[PDB]
Design a protein around this ligand. Structure first.
Ligand SMILES: O=c1ccn([C@@H]2O[C@H](COP(=O)(O)OP(=O)(O)O)[C@@H](O)[C@H]2O)c(=O)[nH]1
Ligand SMILES: O=c1ccn([C@@H]2O[C@H](COP(=O)(O)OP(=O)(O)O)[C@@H](O)[C@H]2O)c(=O)[nH]1
Ligand SMILES: [Mn+2]
Ligand SMILES: [Mn+2]
Ligand code: NA
Ligand code: NA
Ligand code: NA
Length: 522
């Protein structure tokens, strides 16, 4: 049995052909450069014309993202994004959902292809009854050399989870995919069934999706080969433990609670799983995000709070000159400490990013201390990637994106929105992009930041006087981006020149004395 027999099966059936909302197909990729163009091509060939194709590359080390970026330049139907650390297909999926604009959401993996009528037929079945919330069709495993069918538990094709399509409102009503490495398509399907009722999912029993069979893929811990055209598929022990867990959770949790249990972005495991099942950063100390904001940027601050609010344990928000506290701030509740300054005479401006740091050190409380600015668009993977990078240096250094190397025309600037191919030590980090572990510092007085408006310089001096390196970390182009939206260096100079030495002369002693720091310099 071959892919041709599957196509013959579809051509004998009129299911879904008699009838246009925008459909978003979400694709994730991890080191699939050999396959991804054929995958995308099968989607561009859909008979259903009103599509967009959303690609999220999960930090591939091959040139997968180069290829996807090229294709996006050949057609406006394809939009591509890259995560700056490996977080797993469900994190990448959820990121793609946030980027998507369609009213109806389908999926396709970057190593597969599908039938040119998959979206048309599934959409028409989905929309046949207004009570239907989702649809799915059948898949087959295909040997990529011969395109012969690999039967799964004695069936040429069977209903799957990758073939699900559903109304966009599902994610706002029941939350997002659980951010594991595997098994969460099964959980999400059962979450839909639990919340909406299993009859509100329609099955289209046609072989319209073709799963490539390849070594070391996610599902191969389930596979027993019987012969060249037959496998048995059975949950592994860790997969079964996860299923037993989420099945109990579905029975123990009110269905209107799913939305809160499975928020996205996130940094902590929603369900307890072993390390093989999660790539989340799962910090073992709290995460503290600190931000200052002026009222001209209230629209930017809304977007920032919305993307960051579930990437931390607690906000410190210094509102400088806002008249009233925005609803999106008050809705944080006691998750935020809001300092509201009304008199510009009392304002400390950007020094407000470091109010909490003094409090934590005074209380001997540790944490990941994050400083942000209200004119930057932060990505969904931001905090997970930053903590992973701190951990890569055993939390011994400060990291950031916006970096400056001194010897003002001779300064080298590593703008946070431009690419950087490897980590590099620098002299000053922009404090809208900094992350570090609090307990690097055993004493700190914010009053030492005498003048406002120069927090990057003062923070750099705090690092230098404590023999702490500042690392400008690698990232793709536009991982972060600016949204300034239309919103006298005499003290800086005096402070810079009075606090020599700079350049590589302040860096090289630190770099030379620790084997994990050696590649940070030419
Ligand atoms: O860390 C990872 C591993 C996999 N994938 C993607 O997740 C999808 C499903 O993985 P796979 O093809 O291995 O699944 P299987 O064929 O085993 O069901 C594919 O687009 C993979 O490239 C990903 O984004 N991140
Ligand atoms: O009077 C001011 C000026 C700036 N800021 C905040 O300080 C940070 C840095 O401001 P800006 O983006 O203007 O600095 P730049 O990026 O130009 O160095 C931002 O979060 C601003 O909201 C503030 O609270 N008060
Ligand atoms: Mn696959
Ligand atoms: Mn700025
Ligand atoms: Na590779
Ligand atoms: Na199941
Ligand atoms: Na983890």
């Amino acid at each position: 049995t071959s892919i041709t027999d599957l196509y013959n099966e579809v051509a004998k059936s009129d299911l879904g052909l008699v009838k246009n909302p925008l459909v978003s197909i979400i694709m994730t990729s991890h080191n699939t450069a050999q396959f991804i163009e054929a995958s995308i091509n099968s989607l561009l060939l859909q008979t259903y014309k009103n599509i967009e194709i959303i690609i999220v590359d999960d930090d591939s080390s091959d040139n997968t993202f180069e290829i996807a970026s090229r294709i996006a330049n050949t057609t406006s139907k394809v939009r591509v994004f890259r995560l700056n650390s490996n977080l797993g297909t469900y994190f990448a999926k959820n990121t793609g959902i946030l980027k998507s604009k369609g009213d109806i959401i389908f999926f396709q993996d970057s190593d597969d292809v599908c039938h040119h009528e998959r979206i048309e037929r599934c959409v028409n079945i989905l929309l046949a009854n207004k009570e239907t919330i989702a649809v799915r069709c059948a898949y087959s495993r295909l040997a990529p050399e011969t395109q012969h069918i690999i039967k799964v538990n004695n069936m040429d094709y069977r209903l799957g989870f990758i073939t699900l399509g559903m109304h966009r409102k599902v994610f706002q009503e029941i939350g997002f995919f659980n951010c594991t490495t595997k098994g969460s398509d099964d959980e999400f399907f059962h979450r839909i069934a639990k919340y909406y009722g299993k009859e509100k999912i329609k099955n289209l029993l046609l072989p319209l999706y073709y799963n490539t069979m390849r070594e070391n893929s996610l599902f191969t811990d389930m596979v027993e080969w019987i012969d060249n055209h037959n496998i048995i598929q059975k949950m592994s022990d860790t997969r079964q433990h996860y299923a037993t867990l989420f099945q109990a959770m579905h029975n123990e949790t009110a269905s209107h609670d799913f939305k809160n249990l499975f928020q996205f972005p996130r940094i902590y495991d929603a369900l307890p799983v072993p390390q093989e099942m999660s790539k989340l950063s799962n910090p073992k100390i709290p995460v503290y995000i600190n931000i200052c904001s002026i009222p001209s940027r209230i629209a930017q601050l809304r977007r920032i709070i919305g993307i960051l609010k579930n990437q931390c344990d607690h906000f410190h928000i210094y509102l400088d000159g806002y008249v009233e506290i925005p609803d999106f701030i008050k809705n944080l509740g006691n998750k935020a400490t809001v300092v509201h300054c009304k008199d510009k005479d009392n304002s400390i401006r950007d020094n407000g990013k470091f109010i909490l740091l003094e409090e934590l050190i005074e209380k001997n409380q540790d944490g990941y201390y994050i400083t942000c600015d209200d004119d930057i668009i932060y990505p969904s993977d931001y905090i997970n990637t930053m903590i992973k990078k701190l951990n890569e240096y055993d939390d011994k250094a400060v990291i950031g994106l916006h970096g400056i190397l001194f010897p003002s025309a001779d300064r080298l600037v590593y703008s946070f929105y431009k690419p950087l191919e490897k980590d590099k030590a620098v002299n000053v980090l922009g404090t809208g992009t900094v992350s570090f572990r609090v307990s690097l510092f055993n004493q700190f007085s914010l009053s030492d930041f005498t003048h406002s408006g120069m927090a990057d310089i003062y923070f750099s001096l705090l690092c230098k006087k404590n023999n702490i390196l500042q690392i400008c970390i690698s990232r793709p182009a536009n991982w972060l981006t600016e949204d300034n939206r239309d919103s006298n260096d005499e003290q800086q100079t005096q402070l810079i020149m009075e606090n020599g030495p700079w350049g590589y002369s302040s860096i090289y002693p630190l770099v030379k004395n620790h084997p994990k720091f050696t590649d940070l310099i030419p």
